Design a binder for this molecule. Structure first.
Ligand SMILES: *[C@@H]1O[C@H](CO)[C@@H](O[C@@H]2O[C@H](CO)[C@@H](O[C@@H]3O[C@H](CO[C@H]4O[C@H](CO[C@H]5O[C@H](CO)[C@@H](O)[C@H](O)[C@@H]5O)[C@@H](O)[C@H](O[C@H]5O[C@H](CO)[C@@H](O)[C@H](O)[C@@H]5O)[C@@H]4O)[C@@H](O)[C@H](O[C@H]4O[C@H](CO)[C@@H](O)[C@H](O)[C@@H]4O)[C@@H]3O)[C@H](O)[C@H]2NC(C)=O)[C@H](O)[C@H]1NC(C)=O
Ligand SMILES: *[C@@H]1O[C@H](CO)[C@@H](O[C@@H]2O[C@H](CO)[C@@H](O)[C@H](O)[C@H]2NC(C)=O)[C@H](O)[C@H]1NC(C)=O
Ligand SMILES: *[C@@H]1O[C@H](CO)[C@@H](O[C@@H]2O[C@H](CO)[C@@H](O)[C@H](O)[C@H]2NC(C)=O)[C@H](O)[C@H]1NC(C)=O
Ligand SMILES: *[C@@H]1O[C@H](CO)[C@@H](O)[C@H](O)[C@H]1NC(C)=O
Ligand SMILES: *[C@@H]1O[C@H](CO)[C@@H](O)[C@H](O)[C@H]1NC(C)=O
Ligand SMILES: *[C@@H]1O[C@H](CO)[C@@H](O)[C@H](O)[C@H]1NC(C)=O
Ligand SMILES: *[C@@H]1O[C@H](CO)[C@@H](O)[C@H](O)[C@H]1NC(C)=O
Lengths: 537, 261, 537
């Protein structure tokens, strides 16, 4: 009764690989700016010039080195941490402008932040604190986002990692934190991603749920908003603390008489356009102690906004259940409405907000509704696999006419999954289509130290290079978007693959990918995938 | 009788005021315990600024909102404080995290610690003839008797805290009559703490301070020697414990209640 | 992190099969009394004389026929039921004494009960009502139990099957029901089994949980007690209704930081003795809409009793959460303590109970605790199978010395699973041991009408015949407990199978089962299963 794990349309790895050129690399994240791939790792940031004819091995273009002072390692080790835990791992890497990179690191459990030259990667200026900007542990997940020259960050403030926070610092604007030791606000969160969209920043994390803790401990995925123009509360309430923090449960489930939820959020993408909608795509999974399943749910950025206009939650008696809030007791101005909008332009800065509004949003950070998914179910399921699904990369303009959207999914055992976002007969969005499954990990090139860590840690698609870069902690791999010559001269299944990167060209008599020399006859069926009456192998 | 202070001007610096007070539910407005600047220049504007105040690390401890929700009229009354050797001690009565259960405590901070990492808190009381007394009503530091010095194996230099206690841990606001004077040699407190720190630094047990931590935090095993006067790191703090520091009873009664010492 | 589906020790079906001797049989349940196997089905009860040398086909020894009056079928069909739904399906079959069988049937959605001669199976006496004794639908599950000459039954009272009840009728004792339209008592229950043990009857069902409905609808397995000496309440409270009905959630889970529960109870056994403990064994599964898993949890009858001596639940504000009850407000005499026990012998009949006790047990039928399993986890798991586990049969004296306990598990695709209850080094009970997996369904003998229904519907182990009888809706199959000649002359793995039914006899030089002629040398290792240094195949 629960949908069976579907099969890929088509049915290994000898692609280009980057190893630094030997020690572990401990890659922490990959990134692409302009036309260069950044590889943030241990004690280093490596770059690869994408366009420099991608050869046998991918070679380190420019380099960077920032090791930890011997003193800082000593204190680290002394606090009872391990030898390999106490190094400077790069966890923040952001483009401030055309001249400035902003880089933070663990720095052996003593986080700190530097500015670097975009060109030569030589440091400049004084180092400032990495508290609440960068994690202490290399293993923790963190949110680092530059928007309007301010640093929106989410991680932990302390070595012990008790105190988690969503923090805004820098950019000549006063500094704002989420209320410390308040689980109404944050209860043991795991930060996954944040994005810039409208007058708001949207953080996607997961926390111990305060609604459904009625029995045991339950984890919920969340989406939270902050006003970019937040200036902190008055003098009585929320001074130096967010005045626009509202969070809401996300809904990623297969509905039944009782619905089966996916709660363990693993990844959210940046905002994308699919079918003229601004959307994000999230992967989820079942709790570690449960039968292993993973889903991919998509979220319309308007529906996300819609949930914050709805009704709040509240807990009347400290022991009673969570009831919605009747609008009669919501004060005006609206809690969590930005300072300077419809009716709220009468408020110049957030400091002017009355006590009613402030004391309320401090007490009711949680919205009653739960943001619903597009097509109110997962777009993709895996329930009969040993691994969970993690990283997610999207291609919102794949194909000749560029109206098809292809989604790549990374796993934990290197297995990479590729599906196409399906358009219905109605024109509306409608399910997905499991195109291909391929294993990308290279044992003979990435299992070199005491390390074989088949977990994908970063994905970057680069249409310009026509490739997708997949990062394991040991190596980065350049996988071409469409390996079309794989299907062969057998025309029957070159068309049936329904790959928006592939098609048939009659001048050559085989299956090949799209080229900028778009003068030749390129024959593909994607919407119907017509096999009817064609010569077999 | 809900606020007490100790002025510590150890030589070389301007010196400071260590202060603890009840905050009547305003966890935002006033810290429960903090160290303020009490500067030389009487004119100075530095007066009662926190000895340290960054965004995170500060010379103050604030009662979390989490705890003030989870226990009705939760507060911490401070009854006495004293300067002894390298440390400042505060004697505090509070309701306890899950009838009305109250718990008297010893709070110890280094004189020279602005980050407040040195913090460690243990319950205290004394018992005689099966009856137990755990509601601190008064205290007073002083030199030990000659008799009392032999009793605790301390010099006739070292300090002894004399305290008064009520029967049990029930209704601090409406107290009974069974009261008890007892003596606590500082050396015992300083050592009972030293061994609490000791174990916790070998991965043993928990931090066990749920009103301020709001959850369970596992002691981190670390290669750090707990020298005779160690002043905390950013790990294993703030430190608590659920293992009363027992004082030697000196006198009891139930005809009259005891108030001062 | 969630234990992998383990493998069977050893690695098809040409056993004896019974087909009636052609129409569907629609077998509803099997049973064994004395030395005859009863097959309760549609319009019939078939018997097989177990001992009559079990030959090629198993033949119908004596028969029974009870068809539905043509009138009763008409009204049935008229109410909009199907042709094959409106027949007399036998759902109750109980041995009243040595002379009387008590048989009820659906009777085309008009349940009725008869008494039959134990010998010739000819009816006698007037038919009485089947309301709240037998289901209307053939498909519903029902509880039918004779204890102390009274009929304890649980099913539905109405055609529409809205009103479910646990009912006690017959035996010169006044008639008792569970309060109608009270979901505090019963909320849409599915009745699985009931058993006789001590001053109590214990019903095992599952219901829509009223504690955890805080969010959506959740199903909980339950165990409930009734006093055999229940006589109904006073004149103000619970007159003609149970005064000893308390229920409690069962706990069948794999514990984690958040524990993964199994809630969909499928089967409970009768009370059994294992390691000097009185226990029951239950199978469970994940909700239909979820990733498919099944567990087997075992319950010590003393712990079951222990939960009813604990604290009750209550819901202070109609919207507040479920808090335990402080003993201060539990009145005396103890609610749900039998009339005539420690201190309660001062009460001659349950009618004398004060208002305090009665009005309480009417309002608080639910106990705070949740009956815990033996070894606080499942004894067996299946998480990577398409089917769920259902029927369960046990052998508490298998092996030469008869100190090993073997458990058989039935599925839905005919697959039958066999494991051995493991004893620890401590002597205490400790996990299980997946001995064998075998498929019993016979497509060439049970897929004969428009029917291929591979679901096992009844299991009966008969040590006397040395066989286990497995009932599909189409046929009954005689599977021998130990097919030992399967392992062969290869001594290496005849011992390694650790089958308490199997061993090595040197006089023949092959692998064979235990015989009552226990004079011969029978060599087996079960506790260690020693392979060391033996000639291979
Ligand atoms: C303040 O501090 C003082 C000093 O530290 C402390 O008194 C000591 O207390 C400790 C711990 O309770 C005692 O240690 C125990 O000793 C047991 C054996 O003790 C006997 O042997 C002692 C050594 O004898 C040698 O030296 C003498 C020279 O004086 C010589 O004649 C002998 O031949 C021999 O070579 C001896 O000093 C002692 O005699 C004194 O003490 C008794 C009272 O016990 C007194 O009555 C006498 O008048 C005399 O002054 C005694 O005869 C030993 O078995 C025991 O070991 C067990 O426990 C430990 C710890 O659990 C385990 O490790 C071990 O395996 C056993 O299970 C224990 O070690 C020590 O004896 C005391 N020292 C003195 C000088 O009295 C006080 O307690 C402190 N005061 C307060 C109020 O707290
Ligand atoms: C929109 O999605 C649904 C389900 O993915 C499609 O419905 C399927 O239609 C085909 C007929 O071509 C059937 O074979 C499937 O069994 C249907 N699915 C279900 C669940 O019933 C629908 O066709 C899709 N529309 C488009 C244009 O692809
Ligand atoms: C009781 O059960 C446990 C777990 O089933 C057994 O522990 C296992 O011991 C063996 C050593 O012989 C190991 O190979 C397993 O890995 C252990 N299991 C776990 C989970 O650690 C224990 O031996 C059992 N006792 C008996 C007598 O069978
Ligand atoms: C999640 O979505 C499904 C279908 O869209 C809906 O039936 C269910 O009630 C939703 N749950 C929540 C908590 O929003
Ligand atoms: C994309 O556009 C072309 C025409 O411009 C059309 O033929 C093709 O079917 C379109 N694909 C989709 C998915 O709408
Ligand atoms: C079920 O059992 C486990 C372990 O025995 C325990 O930790 C858990 O809290 C129990 N849950 C309930 C509801 O009894
Ligand atoms: C059963 O009993 C015999 C001795 O009587 C012993 O050899 C055998 O190991 C026992 N089996 C178990 C499981 O205790």
């Amino acid at each position: 009764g629960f949908p069976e794990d579907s099969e890929p349309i088509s049915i290994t790895k000898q692609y280009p690989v980057f190893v630094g050129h030997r020690h572990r690399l401990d890659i922490q994240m990959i990134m692409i700016m302009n036309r260069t791939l950044y590889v943030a790792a241990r004690d280093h940031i490596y770059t690869v010039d994408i366009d420099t004819s991608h050869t046998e091995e991918i070679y380190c273009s420019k380099k960077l080195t920032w090791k930890s002072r011997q003193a800082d390692v000593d204190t680290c080790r002394m606090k009872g941490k391990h030898k390999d835990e106490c190094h400077n791992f790069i966890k923040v890497l952001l483009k401030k402008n055309d001249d400035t990179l902003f880089v933070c690191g663990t720095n052996a459990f003593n986080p700190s932040c530097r500015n670097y030259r975009v060109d030569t990667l030589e440091t400049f200026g004084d180092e400032f604190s990495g508290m609440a900007r960068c994690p202490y542990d290399a293993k923790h997940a963190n949110i680092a986002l530059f928007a309007d020259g301010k640093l929106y960050s989410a991680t932990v403030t302390d070595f012990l990692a008790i105190d988690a926070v969503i923090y805004r610092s820098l950019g000549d604007s006063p500094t704002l934190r989420t209320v410390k030791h308040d689980s109404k606000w944050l209860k043991e969160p795991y930060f996954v991603q944040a994005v810039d969209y409208g007058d708001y920043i949207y953080f996607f994390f997961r926390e111990i749920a305060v609604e459904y803790n009625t029995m045991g401990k339950v984890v919920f995925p969340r989406v939270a908003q902050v006003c970019k123009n937040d200036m902190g509360g008055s003098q009585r309430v929320l001074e130096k603390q967010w005045t626009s923090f509202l969070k809401a449960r996300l809904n990623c489930s297969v509905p039944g008489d009782s619905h089966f939820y996916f709660n363990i959020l693993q990844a959210v993408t940046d905002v994308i356009r699919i079918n003229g909608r601004d959307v994000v795509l999230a992967t989820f999974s079942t709790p570690y102690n449960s039968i292993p399943g993973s889903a991919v749910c998509a979220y319309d950025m308007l529906d996300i906004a819609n949930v914050f206009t709805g009704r709040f939650k509240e807990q009347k008696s400290p022991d009673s259940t969570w009831t919605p809030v009747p609008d009669e007791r919501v004060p005006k101005p609206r809690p969590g409405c930005c300072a300077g909008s419809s009716s709220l332009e009468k408020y110049a800065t957030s400091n002017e907000f009355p006590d009613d509004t402030l004391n309320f949003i401090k007490t009711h950070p949680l919205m009653d509704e739960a943001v619903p998914s597009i097509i109110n179910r997962p777009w993709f399921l895996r329930t009969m696999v040993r691994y969970r699904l993690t990283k997610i990369a999207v291609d919102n303009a794949a194909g000749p006419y560029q109206n098809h959207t292809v989604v790549f999914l990374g796993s934990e055992k290197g297995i990479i999954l590729k599906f196409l976002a399906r358009i219905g007969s109605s024109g509306f969005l409608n399910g997905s289509l499991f195109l291909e499954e391929m294993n990308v990990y290279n044992p003979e090139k990435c299992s070199y130290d005491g390390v074989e860590d088949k977990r994908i840690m970063g994905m970057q698609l680069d249409r310009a290079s026509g490739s997708l870069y997949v990062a394991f902690s040991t190596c980065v791999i350049k996988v071409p978007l469409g390996r079309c010559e794989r299907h062969g001269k057998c025309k029957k299944t070159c068309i049936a693959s329904r790959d928006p990167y592939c098609g048939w060209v009659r001048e050559s008599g085989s299956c090949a990918h799209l080229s900028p020399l778009s003068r030749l006859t390129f024959e593909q069926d994607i919407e119907r995938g017509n096999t009817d009456g064609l010569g077999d192998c | 009788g809900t606020m007490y202070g100790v002025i510590v001007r150890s030589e070389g610096e301007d010196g400071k005021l260590f202060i603890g007070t009840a905050v009547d539910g305003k966890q935002d407005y006033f810290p429960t315990l903090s160290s303020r600047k009490l500067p030389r220049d009487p004119e100075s504007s530095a007066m009662l600024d926190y000895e340290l105040h960054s965004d995170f690390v500060s010379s103050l401890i604030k009662i979390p909102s989490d705890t003030l929700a989870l226990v009705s009229h939760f507060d911490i009354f401070y009854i006495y404080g004293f300067a002894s050797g390298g440390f400042v001690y505060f004697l505090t009565v509070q309701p306890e995290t899950p009838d009305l259960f109250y718990t008297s405590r010893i709070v110890r901070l280094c004189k020279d610690d602005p980050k407040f990492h040195s913090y460690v808190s243990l319950p205290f009381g004394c018992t005689r003839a099966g009856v137990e007394y755990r509601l601190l009503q008064a205290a007073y530091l002083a030199k030990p008797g000659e008799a009392l010095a032999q009793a605790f194996n301390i010099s006739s230099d070292e300090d002894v805290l004399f305290a008064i206690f009520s029967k049990g841990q029930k209704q601090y606001h409406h107290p009974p009559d069974d009261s008890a004077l007892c003596a606590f040699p500082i050396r015992a407190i300083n050592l009972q703490i030293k061994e609490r720190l000791q174990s916790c630094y070998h991965g043993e047990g928990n931090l066990e301070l749920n009103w301020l931590l709001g959850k369970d935090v596992q002691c981190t095993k670390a290669p750090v020697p707990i020298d005779d006067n160690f002043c905390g790191l950013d790990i294993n703090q703030p430190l608590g414990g659920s293992t009363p520091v027992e004082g030697l009873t000196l006198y009891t009664t139930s005809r009259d209640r005891l108030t001062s010492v």
